[PDB]
């Protein structure tokens, strides 16, 4: 495979990413960072994640991953395996694995770059971001997120790159 495989994820201090098929927090500023970074690049989404989003995201190829061979959504592409995704994206520069947990597990052996926002709070949750061995990964970007009236937690943007 030729395209760069980037994970895009926000998690808490215990790796929680979801509660009851939704996001446990509201951070409009973190969401804006996500738009800025992913704009014009394909988003790879697990079926559940996609249905929780509820609509195609503009200016990006939306690719939904499902085992269901009769699944169709207007304005979205459908893939049924890692390889089908790699076929659909064979000419792309960078794709974003956009969640949730099952889809992160799926593409974990292949990930080249990690865009991870870390939120400094312990949420109640049921869905978790998988453990990663960071040997041969270097942090290439870190920045404190905007904490204000509308964004009520402390969080940092991190970006890691796999080496070689
Ligand atoms: N905080 C964040 O950064 C973030 C990001 C994304 C999602 N989330 C949250 O995480 C939760 C969703 O994560 P999740 O793991 O429950 O769901 P998910 O990974 O988004 O979707 C699960 C679905 O993916 C499909 N799938 C899984 N493995 C597959 C495979 N090997 N081949 C083909 N299709 C496969 C299946 O679809 P079918 O049933 O249709 O066969 C499965 O039902 C939600 O709460 C969401 O809001 C958080
Ligand atoms: C915004 C947290 C988030 N942060 C990071 N760093 N990565 C992620 N993968 C997600 C996520 C997610 C899942 C998710 C995304 C959007 C969304 C809407 C419009 N443009 C972009 C995204 C809406 C609802 C939603 O859950 C119902």
Q: How many domain units?
A: 1
Strand content: 25-35%
Q: What is the CATH T-level topology? A: Dihydrofolate Reductase, subunit A
For the record, give the distance between the C-alpha atoms at the N and C termini, rounded to a whole number: 16 Å
Radius of gyration: 15 Å
Percent in helix: 10-25%
Tell me about the largest β-sheet.
Answer: 8 strands, mixed
The number of helical segments is 4
Biggest sheet, strands in spatial order?
5-4-3-6-1-7-10-9
What form results from the Cα inertia axes? globular
CATH class: Alpha Beta
Structural category is alpha/beta
* Number of distinct beta strands: 10
Return the CATH architecture. Answer: 3-Layer(aba) Sandwich
Attached small molecules: NADP nicotinamide-adenine-dinucleotide phosphate, the ligand CCc1nc(N)nc(N)c1C#CCc1cc(-c2ccncc2)ccc1OC
What is the CATH H-level superfamily?
Dihydrofolate Reductase, subunit A
The H/E string reads EEHEHEEHEHEEEE
Enzyme class: oxidoreductase
EC number: 1.5.1.3
Organism: Bacillus anthracis (anthrax bacterium)
Catalytic activity: (6S)-5,6,7,8-tetrahydrofolate + NADP(+) = 7,8-dihydrofolate + NADPH + H(+)
